[PDB]
From a paper:
Type II binding is confirmed by the first crystal structure of RIPK2 solved in complex with ponatinib, which reveals an allosteric site suitable for the rational design of RIPK2-selective small molecules. The structure was solved by molecular replacement and refined at 2.75 Å resolution. The bound ponatinib inhibitor occupies the ATP pocket established between the N- and C-terminal lobes of the kinase. As a result, RIPK2 displays an inactive conformation of the catalytic domain characterized by a “DFG-Asp out, αC-Glu in” configuration. The β3 lysine (Lys47) and αC glutamine (Glu66) establish the catalytically relevant salt bridge, whereas the DFG aspartate (Asp164) is flipped away from the active site, rendering the enzyme inactive. The RIPK2 structure reveals a homodimeric packing arrangement similar to that of RIPK3 (Xie et al., 2013b) and consistent with the dimeric state observed in solution by analytical gel filtration. The imidazo[1,2-b]pyridazine head group establishes a single hydrogen bond to the hinge residue Met98 as well as hydrophobic interactions with Tyr97 and Leu24. The central linker forms two additional hydrogen bonds with the side chain of Glu66 and the main-chain nitrogen of Asp164. The trifluoromethyl group occupies the hydrophobic pocket vacated by the inverted DFG motif, while the protonated methylpiperazine forms an ionic-dipole interaction with the main-chain oxygen atoms of Leu143 and His144, positioned within the αD-β6 loop. In particular, the allosteric hydrophobic pocket occupied by the trifluoromethyl group is greatly enlarged in RIPK2 due to the presence of Ala73 in the αC helix.
NOD activation induces pro-inflammatory signaling by receptor-interacting protein kinase 2 (RIPK2, also known as RIP2 or RICK), which plays an obligatory and specific role in activation of NOD-dependent, but not Toll-like receptor responses (Park et al., 2007). Signaling by RIPK2 is dependent on an N-terminal kinase domain with dual Ser/Thr and Tyr kinase activities (Dorsch et al., 2006; Tigno-Aranjuez et al., 2010), as well as a C-terminal caspase activation and recruitment domain (CARD) that mediates CARD-CARD domain assembly with activated NODs (Inohara et al., 1999; Ogura et al., 2001b). Once engaged, RIPK2 is activated by autophosphorylation (Dorsch et al., 2006) and further targeted by XIAP (X-linked inhibitor of apoptosis) and other E3 ligases for non-degradative polyubiquitination (Bertrand et al., 2011; Damgaard et al., 2012; Tao et al., 2009; Tigno-Aranjuez et al., 2013; Yang et al., 2007, 2013). The structure of RIPK2 exhibits the canonical bilobal kinase fold followed by a 16-residue αJ helix that packs alongside the loop connecting the αD and αE helices.
Author numbering:
A (entry chain A): 8 to 165, 188 to 198, 207 to 316
B (entry chain B): 9 to 49, 55 to 165, 188 to 316
Write the structure that this text describes.
């Protein structure tokens, strides 16, 4: 009702970004708003395009109902014979995944920025869980966490199974994913790197194994290392009932975040952008 | 479509403004764990004025418009909840020279660019929204000094053809751009428009007759980047003839090349400098 319908011909300079499941994510410039945008457009040459339409409108309805500071903001729908899609704000600094694992482009990612990111992911998911009815994400991974021009988090949805809790091979799924993500953020390692076949991963996890917690994985200089290890281990407990709520997580995190002097967040970000611009 | 937030979910309320439509207070939402602003004012008609405002803000979601988070609608309490903007208004940034003694040029242009992006979006809605009360007091600044447009001495932002009220003045499509020109002059000078004249009727008369804030070396110093493109923009914007004034879409197009000369890192640096001086001074 409030959601603009954007004609395809109003979208200029389309550049590919991703080929997600049903179709492509591209960057563009809106000709009248003069801002950059992202657009997710499904393929037109499918026999199952009838249901494709339905999926797109259901997705836009969701994103629109879920407006919030840490959820990717939707700007409109494209709905024409030649072109079907969702338009959102464009996040110039890509995904958390890239931030963590492109060590040539991002050789230092200061601790405060990392805790901010974890705090904001929690704020986002928590808001979804507090909607009426609750929205459950059920596909959290670092690929789905986007970062705006100041490296604030925008949660989205588009190596799969590592973020999945064993009992899904549920109100307690997102928090499992968030624990792995947390391990991932503090370590900058791929969970289960030295492990080829993902069936072996599902088995190991079935049996209670988790990413390794180590001097090698989580070095001893991590601020609040021990509070954070507790959070991770609660979060990915074999028993879903031992895993905490996101609200409990935020409460555990708030004092950790209060330790950082506010200027240090901006300093962490300015450093990153400076190094990124030189790669 | 828009959450209804119970008053008892809002913790630690602290006064901020006693604006037009009610009191504006800061608070913390007990379940979302974020800070918020809340504007709280017949059970027939008072509601409609608030519900009409929330409908507007909700219809107008965009990067540079103040984001509405919900409505409070209870027997004890009626209001609108929005995101909270910790760095106050553009007005404070410009005129509190003790707290903010240097405001680097690039940050200033970014702000101007973003005000234009906001008003432009309003003008492009269906039907168009017209602001008609732009001033520096209504431009808010988020944690990284990005702009959020809002609405809550005054006549200086008003174009002369709106002095005589009516159905002409209301449907004027060229009001916001006049206000934006004065704001622009204000941002580049950090002077009050018409500081020298005591009585605001003499201001209305002078403006009736084509006079505008003074442009020169004292008001707009020679070191302003793109001084001459910017003076042109201001002057087209506040032209006596409404038809010579540009659309905000034209405005943005005139600005885009100016903004492109600043390396993007420079905006963040300007913001760091502010926060450092605000803290160390
Ligand atoms: C164009 C576009 C369209 C849609 C979506 C999208 O995220 N849709 C979405 C669907 C569902 C949900 C919640 N559910 C999860 C599943 N489900 C079981 C529950 C409900 C959410 C969430 F935000 F709420 F999480 C989002 C993102 C983009 C993007 C983009 C973009 C912007 N900058 C860049 C830079 C690089 C790459 N991409 N990119
Ligand atoms: C709680 C709250 C509620 C509402 C509004 C509000 O701005 N409502 C609004 C009404 C109409 C319009 C557009 N129209 C203009 C007239 N009109 C003829 C056309 C339509 C717009 C606009 F933004 F779109 F302009 C906004 C702001 C606040 C705030 C706040 C806040 C947050 N942090 C701080 C820090 C210090 C002080 N305040 N504060």
């Amino acid at each position: 009702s409030a959601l603009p319908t954007i004609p395809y011909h109003k979208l200029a300079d389309l550049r590919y970004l991703s080929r997600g499941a049903s179709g492509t994510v591209s960057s563009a410039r809106h000709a009248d708003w003069r801002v950059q945008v992202a657009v997710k457009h499904l393929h037109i040459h499918t026999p199952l395009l009838d249901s494709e339409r339905k999926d797109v409108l259901r997705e836009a309805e969701i994103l629109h109902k879920a407006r919030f500071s840490y959820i990717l903001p939707i700007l409109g729908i494209c709905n024409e014979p030649e072109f079907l899609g969702i338009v959102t704000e464009y996040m110039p600094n890509g995904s958390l995944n890239e931030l963590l694992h492109r060590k040539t482009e991002y050789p230092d990612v200061a601790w405060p920025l990392r805790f901010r990111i974890l705090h904001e992911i929690a704020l986002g998911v928590n808001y979804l869980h507090n909607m009426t009815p609750p929205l459950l994400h059920h596909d959290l991974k670092t690929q789905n966490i986007l970062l705006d021009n100041e490296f604030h988090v925008k949660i989205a949805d588009f190596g799969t199974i590592i973020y999945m809790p064993p009992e899904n091979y549920s109100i307690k799924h997102d928090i499992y994913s968030y624990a792995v993500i947390t391990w991932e953020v503090l370590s900058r390692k791929q969970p289960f790197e030295d492990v080829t076949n993902p069936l072996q991963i599902m088995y190991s996890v079935s049996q209670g194994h988790r990413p390794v917690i180590n001097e090698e994985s989580l070095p001893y200089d991590i601020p609040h290392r021990a509070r954070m290890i507790s959070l991770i281990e609660s979060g990915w407990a074999q028993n879903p009932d031992e895993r905490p709520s996101f609200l409990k997580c935020l409460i555990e995190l708030e004092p950790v975040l209060r330790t950082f002097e506010e200027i240090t967040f901006l300093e962490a970000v300015i450093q990153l952008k400076k190094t990124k611009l030189q790669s």
